[PDB]
Chains A and B, each alone.
Chain A
Amino acid sequence: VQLQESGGGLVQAGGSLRLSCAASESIFRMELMEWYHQAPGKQRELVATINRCGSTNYSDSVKGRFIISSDNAKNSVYLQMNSLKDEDTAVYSCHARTWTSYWGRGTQVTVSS
């Protein structure tokens, strides 16, 4: 329920952090799920996406720093951030679309620079 995330807060530039959007409904029945972010004063933008088969995509400002993964032992989709810069300060939200779309409330991530 709630597809809730557990991770975020204040980080130092060049640090690392883990996000653990975890679901009670089975991870494999999702058939597509992603992470977006809303920047302060800026409209929401997609971070990364993974579908059921295994295809994985990111936006231009995403590749090379943090990748997406999902370990099939506790149903969850992982996005570990590496070497954050100040401009990644935003609210991160995880979305999973079964026969209807399901949403979490996201988490604040702020980099100190």
Chain B
Amino acid sequence: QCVNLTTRTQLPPAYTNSFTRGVYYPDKVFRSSVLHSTQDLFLPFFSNVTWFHAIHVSGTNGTKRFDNPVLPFNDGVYFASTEKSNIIRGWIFGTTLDSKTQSLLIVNNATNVVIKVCEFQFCNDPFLGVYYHKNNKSWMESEFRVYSSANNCTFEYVSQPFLMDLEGNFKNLREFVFKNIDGYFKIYSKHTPINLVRDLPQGFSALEPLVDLPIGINITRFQTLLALHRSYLTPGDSSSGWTAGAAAYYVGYLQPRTFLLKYNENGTITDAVDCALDPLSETKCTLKSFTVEKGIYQTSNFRVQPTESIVRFPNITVCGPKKSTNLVKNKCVNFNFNGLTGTGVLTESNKKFLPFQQFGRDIADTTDAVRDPQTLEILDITPCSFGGVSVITPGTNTSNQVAVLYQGVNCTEVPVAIHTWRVYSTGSNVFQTRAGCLIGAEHVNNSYECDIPIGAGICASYQTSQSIIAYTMSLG
């Protein structure tokens, strides 16, 4: 059945960040000595994962309590566990975790492994006991208190017998990337042995798939089953558990991103580069290499997006006259004047329309001026700004600092118009050129024979205040 423990008290958790972890084999092919660009669900590089200690001591006395809160599930979960006594045992998945909706269950029962999908009646605090005493023969007698009952189960599984917990720093890492797509339960998994650690360390480990489960249920929330080393009837304070819950687990949530994976000759994924993390990483992804030489490279195109859409049909009459809400100017918006649709910034114009004219076209391809139906103020439209983005870098293996040149635009509009990496536009390092706006480089009055040609008589170079400087080229 079920047993009620004490309240979780909503403890404020520490956080840690996963330095380049949790990339798995996306496809089912064998690729050797290739650099492949894969767009799929991955855990972002250098992302914050939240880590729970298995058993926390709210006081050093021995006041020990579980940390197994229910957590969301949006398009996959990277779950790592660092532990040495199989204190974590499995997971439940579902939407409501009650009798209303189907629920899936993976758990290690002592020695066997059982997977089910039923209408389990999960209570609030599932736990698996394993206590011992020297007298008689107990040696982890156990209690299995996960679900009250199960009805008309569809998927069944059991495995074979095995071993249990111990009645010492070789903590093992176990990583899983549970994702549910197309009514499946892709469980990418990998075990590794590590020693002399306290948290999850920086490292790289490609994860290989383990099993696909044909399940086909709606999944939104999941929990974690923890092995208890005690008994609620006679709960001990200290040394009852495993060193005050040093074993712990980390949760992070996948996002749809593009990665550059480096398959070595053997077909084993060795390195990865996250495109959307840095300007330098986008340069690597566009050049399809892990090292880039000195120069400037055009990565992508920056375009101002229309903020809000406005309409302006109101002729005033006949048929059904409509309304236009309001009118906004000096702002890049989507506009529909009497059915003429487009995007642009509307501004007050000094052109003088003849009384019988509606719109003008000085360029012969685009109507640069328009007459407003409500008030006869004549508005000229200008296309929202855009331009290429060039990444100025010295040698990739000299330094990882780069500068960014937005070509052919003023940069009173760069930080907000575009939505990846963020600039924050420090006041001193947004030097303006004729060729565009420069971000991440300072100004130097001195002149040198110019290394990297930026344009309009400005060239940039590297000096050990940002490491990259821009100056006006000298002729000798």
Contact = CB atoms under 8 A, between A and B. Distances in A.
- The winner among A1, A26, A99 for most chain B CB atoms within 10 A is A99
B200 to A, nearest CB: 13
Given A52-B19, A102-B426, A28 B48 contact: yes
Contacts of B14: 72-73
A99 B282 CA distance: 12
A100 B428 CA distance: 13
B12 A73 contact: yes
Contacts of B12: 73
A53 B202 contact: yes
A97 B46 contact: no
A100 B15 contact: no
A26 B46 CA distance: 9
B279 A99 contact: yes
Q: How large is the interface on B (under 10, 10 to 19, 20 to 34, 35 or more residues)?
A: 20 to 34
Nearest to B19: A52
Given A99-B278, A99-B279, A99-B440, A28 B466 contact: no
B255 interface: no
**Chain B interface SS verdict (over half):** loop
B426 A99 contact: no
Interface in B414-445: 421-422, 424, 426, 428-429, 439-440
Contacts of B466: 100-101
Contacts of B402: 99-100
B403 A100 contact: yes
Contact of B46 (A24, A28, A53, A101): A28
A101 B424 contact: no
A99 B421 contact: yes
Contacts of A52: 19
Interface in B267-286: 278-280
A29 B9 CA distance: 31
B32 interface: no
Contact of A102 (B17, B278, B421, B424): B424
Interface of B: 12, 14-17, 19, 46, 48, 202, 278-280, 400-403, 421-422, 424, 426, 428-429, 439-440, 465-467
